[PDB]
Amino acid sequence: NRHYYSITINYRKNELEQKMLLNLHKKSWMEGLTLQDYVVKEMLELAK
């Protein structure tokens, strides 16, 4: 702190980019194409 201090850094919005990053993220992770898996028969024994 001898002649130093940190500064404010916000992670600001990009309206050109934020909703489409959200589009990428969500709509590529919710089943990818959203039509794929809608494992199952051995997790029976695993869960019991």
């Binding site: 990818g32 194409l33 039509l35 794929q36 898996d37 199952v40 028969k41």
Partner: protein
């Protein structure tokens, strides 16, 4: 010889008697056909091994195939009758590595050998294949539809 081995499809024993008993009289080489077929004390044991070949020629493809056929129909498509079926199929159920299925109950058999321990691969095959083909249906049918409207 090779045609008796590629997919094998059935065989008639008497057509084999024709094709490989006219070779025991027709001569170009004559000594190997003697040693295998023309001989008696060992060549006739090799005729018995040829009978093993024709019946295993039956049994290999009939272990590949024939789910829900009957039995007299089975023996007449074996080209060997029902008592010959019990002989010729007992001496290859002693092979004890092919699982088959017969019943009597009047003289009628059935099939589907493992008694279907499956509700799993139904889901696997059916749903994973069909659903992933359907998610391909978008990615390439709308691709070709956009292609045919690029060229329109």
């Amino acid at each position: 010889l090779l045609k008796l081995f590629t997919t094998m499809e059935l065989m008639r024993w008497s057509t084999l008697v024709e094709d490989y008993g006219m070779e025991l009289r027709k001569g170009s080489l004559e000594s190997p056909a003697t040693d295998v077929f023309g001989s008696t004390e060992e060549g006739e044991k090799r005729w018995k091994d040829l009978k093993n070949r024709v019946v295993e020629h039956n049994i290999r493809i009939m272990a590949k195939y024939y789910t829900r056929i009957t039995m007299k129909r089975m023996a007449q498509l074996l080209d060997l009758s029902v008592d010959e079926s019990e002989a010729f199929l007992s001496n290859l159920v002693v092979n004890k590595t092919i699982f088959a299925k017969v019943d009597r109950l009047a003289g009628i058999i059935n099939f589907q050998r493992p008694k279907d321990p499956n509700n799993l691969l139904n889901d696997w095959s059916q749903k994973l294949n069909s659903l992933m083909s359907l998610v391909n249906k978008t990615t390439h049918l709308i691709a070709k539809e956009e292609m045919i409207h690029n060229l329109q």
